[PDB]
């Protein structure tokens, strides 16, 4: 009934169409990192931090934009879904000026964590 079988490390989820992989994974709790995305602004994959290995794929997808089709199993804590992040945050942190103590957003930075977490 306008619902699609989707898998997240084995979950038997059902979701409306036109939904991202986030809006699926967000149900369970596999909260994906985010820099280009907001829950209310238009979609634009520029950060390329929300990557994940969909099961049975050589290429990853920007989950912010990639909608969700039947039979797709995600691997959020794969090696390939963390290599995709340890690299990314290790790119951002090459033009960033180390100003955290100067920075107004010390504990309210959504990057300091997401360099720690992943």
């Amino acid at each position: 009934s306008n619902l699609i079988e989707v898998f997240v490390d084995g979950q038997s989820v059902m979701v409306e169409p036109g939904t991202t992989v986030l809006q699926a994974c967000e149900k369970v709790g596999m909260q994906i990192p985010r820099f280009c995305y907001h829950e209310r602004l238009s979609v634009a994959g520029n950060c390329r931090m929300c990557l994940v290995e969909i099961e049975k794929a050589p290429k990853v997808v920007a989950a912010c934009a990639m909608p969700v089709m039947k039979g797709w199993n995600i691997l959020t804590n794969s090696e390939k879904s963390k290599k995709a992040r340890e690299g990314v945050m290790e790119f951002l942190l090459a033009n960033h000026p180390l100003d955290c103590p100067i920075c107004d957003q010390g504990g309210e930075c959504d990057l300091q964590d997401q360099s720690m977490m992943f």
């Binding site: 804590n77 090696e79 290599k83």
Partner: protein, 99 residues
Amino acid sequence: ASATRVIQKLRNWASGQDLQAKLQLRYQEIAKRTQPPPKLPVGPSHKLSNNYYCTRDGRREVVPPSIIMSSQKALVEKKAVTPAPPMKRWELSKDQPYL
């Protein structure tokens, strides 16, 4: 120091062992202050390749415990069991056995 080569024999006769060589306190030939500045060693993973966080993350290799009854979920000849071999009576302390 200024031990006049008699009281040493008074100390040692009154105490025992020749203790001018193993005296109480320190004078010299120790800790010649301002040792040079050291260039430390570095730890591993300063190696720039085959160095991810996945092959070092100590805290994501843990998992929840492995429950074995789970009074509603699992709830599931045979030999006796102990948590280990009953370990040994050790030894009897060679080179200083009875002190």
